[PDB]
Amino acid sequence: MSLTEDNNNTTITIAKGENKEIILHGNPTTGYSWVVDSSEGLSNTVEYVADQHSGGKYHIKITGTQTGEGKIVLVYRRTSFAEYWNLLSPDRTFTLKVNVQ
Amino acid sequence: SLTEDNNNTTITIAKGENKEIILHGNPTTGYSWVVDSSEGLSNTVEYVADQHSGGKYHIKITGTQTGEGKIVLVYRRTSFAEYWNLLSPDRTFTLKVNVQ
Amino acid sequence: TLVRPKPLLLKLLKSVGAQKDTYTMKEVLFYLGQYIMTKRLYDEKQQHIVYCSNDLLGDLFGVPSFSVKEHRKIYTMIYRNLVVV
Amino acid sequence: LVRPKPLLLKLLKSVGAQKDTYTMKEVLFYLGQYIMTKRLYDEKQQHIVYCSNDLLGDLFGVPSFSVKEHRKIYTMIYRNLVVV
Ligand SMILES: [Cl-]
Ligand SMILES: [Cl-]
Ligand SMILES: [Cl-]
Ligand SMILES: [Cl-]
Ligand SMILES: [Cl-]
Ligand SMILES: [Cl-]
Ligand SMILES: [Cl-]
């Protein structure tokens, strides 16, 4: 039904528009959280759900959005001081919206 | 081709159609143009030095999915902190997903 | 954008290896980051939070702590501690 | 859990380390602190660390090294500690 840590580095099949759920234990009181590092062919949502009876579980709901070989990579990370401080000085950016017809 | 003139605009291409973005950069500084994100599009990035100083980054994109796509490029230089952080790799979760 | 840091900020910048009286804003931000990194003033679990109530930095910013996420607040506090040339 | 040999220990302590026994994660943290504080990395290619005129150079036995070479760095660190 749902994927967990044991499904790490495997391949699954889903229908375009079908939802599936990944559940991973996490403890955000440390400052770490599960975040989507990259994906392809999918949309997603990430939610933290506290264990009601340390830490809790991240629910990453994926939905197949384009037919083909997709992928999702999640990382358990904590943003560093250096990363926050770097953001005070923004890099030159080029942004282009593209309507694909 | 598209240039800095087209920054922060919207275009409309057909699925499978290609477009080229050309941006000036100077990798001798350690900076380069890199793709920050690329929804609905595939891309390639190539640097060509000005033979006649820096040069031009050629970012070729192709519409790979019908819908509202977007690419964001950043002119950046990887910091020491970013390099050093990778010596202590974060736990990762990876799932290949064949969408039918 | 060239700036001359007021005396507290100048003392902070020189404590981490700066040797000038005039700086670019890029340099000011760099040395201020060096300072916070070196003295590990940031919170380990939430590393955008900087504790400085017992520090020279707290004196010149006039706060017990601040968040690096609040960009305009940061720039405001820095600007109050320099004069543009 | 590791025990840094004297020269490595001296480096870590010069940037705030207090103890004698560490995890590798901690050793890597203070080594990073050290390199950043003394600004030994190259400005344009920040993975390059110049240490030929620094005690880190003596310790690692190199004029410079690249942060991209992960195995090499772990190796140089391991040579300078005892695995407790
Ligand atoms: Cl598999
Ligand atoms: Cl830093
Ligand atoms: Cl001066
Ligand atoms: Cl937070
Ligand atoms: Cl505020
Ligand atoms: Cl100890
Ligand atoms: Cl390089």
From Swiss-Prot, chain D:
Induction conditions: By DNA damage.
Domain notes: Region I is sufficient for binding p53 and inhibiting its G1 arrest and apoptosis functions. It also binds p73 and E2F1. Region II contains most of a central acidic region required for interaction with ribosomal protein L5 and a putative C4-type zinc finger. The RING finger domain which coordinates two molecules of zinc interacts specifically with RNA whether or not zinc is present and mediates the heterooligomerization with MDM4. It is also essential for its ubiquitin ligase E3 activity toward p53 and itself.
Other facts: MDM2 RING finger mutations that failed to ubiquitinate p53 in vitro did not target p53 for degradation when expressed in cells.
The protein's assembly and partners: Interacts with p53/TP53, TP73/p73, RBL5 and RP11. Binds specifically to RNA. Can interact with RB1, E1A-associated protein EP300 and the E2F1 transcription factor. Forms a ternary complex with p53/TP53 and WWOX. Interacts with CDKN2AIP, RFWD3, USP7, PYHIN1, and RBBP6. Interacts with ARRB1 and ARRB2. Interacts with PSMA3. Found in a trimeric complex with MDM2, MDM4 and USP2. Interacts with USP2 (via N-terminus and C-terminus). Interacts with MDM4. Part of a complex with MDM2, DAXX, RASSF1 and USP7. Part of a complex with DAXX, MDM2 and USP7. Interacts directly with DAXX and USP7.
Sufficient to promote the mitochondrial pathway of apoptosis as annotated region, ranges: 1-75
UniProt note on tissues of expression: Ubiquitous. Isoform Mdm2-A, isoform Mdm2-B, isoform Mdm2-C, isoform Mdm2-D, isoform Mdm2-E, isoform Mdm2-F and isoform Mdm2-G are observed in a range of cancers but absent in normal tissues.
Compartments reported by the entry: Nucleus, Nucleoplasm; Cytoplasm; Nucleus, Nucleolus; Nucleus
Entry comment on modification after translation: Phosphorylated at multiple sites near the RING domain by ATM upon DNA damage; this promotes its ubiquitination and degradation, preventing p53/TP53 degradation. Autoubiquitination leads to proteasomal degradation; resulting in p53/TP53 activation it may be regulated by SFN. Also ubiquitinated by TRIM13. ATM-phosphorylated MDM2 is ubiquitinated by the SCF(FBXO31) complex in response to genotoxic stress, promoting its degradation and p53/TP53-mediated DNA damage response. Deubiquitinated by USP2 leads to its accumulation and increases deubiquitination and degradation of p53/TP53. Deubiquitinated by USP7 leading to its stabilization.
Superkingdom classification of source: Eukaryota
The SWIB/MDM2 domain, residue ranges: 1-83
Positions spanned in the full protein: 27 to 110 of 491
Record's protein name: E3 ubiquitin-protein ligase Mdm2
Region entry Necessary for interaction with USP2, spans: 1-84
Disorder named in the UniProt entry: Seems to be amplified in certain tumors (including soft tissue sarcomas, osteosarcomas and gliomas). A higher frequency of splice variants lacking p53 binding domain sequences was found in late-stage and high-grade ovarian and bladder carcinomas. Four of the splice variants show loss of p53 binding.
Family: Belongs to the MDM2/MDM4 family.
Free-text function comment from the UniProt entry: E3 ubiquitin-protein ligase that mediates ubiquitination of p53/TP53, leading to its degradation by the proteasome. Inhibits p53/TP53- and p73/TP73-mediated cell cycle arrest and apoptosis by binding its transcriptional activation domain. Also acts as a ubiquitin ligase E3 toward itself and ARRB1. Permits the nuclear export of p53/TP53. Promotes proteasome-dependent ubiquitin-independent degradation of retinoblastoma RB1 protein. Inhibits DAXX-mediated apoptosis by inducing its ubiquitination and degradation. Component of the TRIM28/KAP1-MDM2-p53/TP53 complex involved in stabilizing p53/TP53.
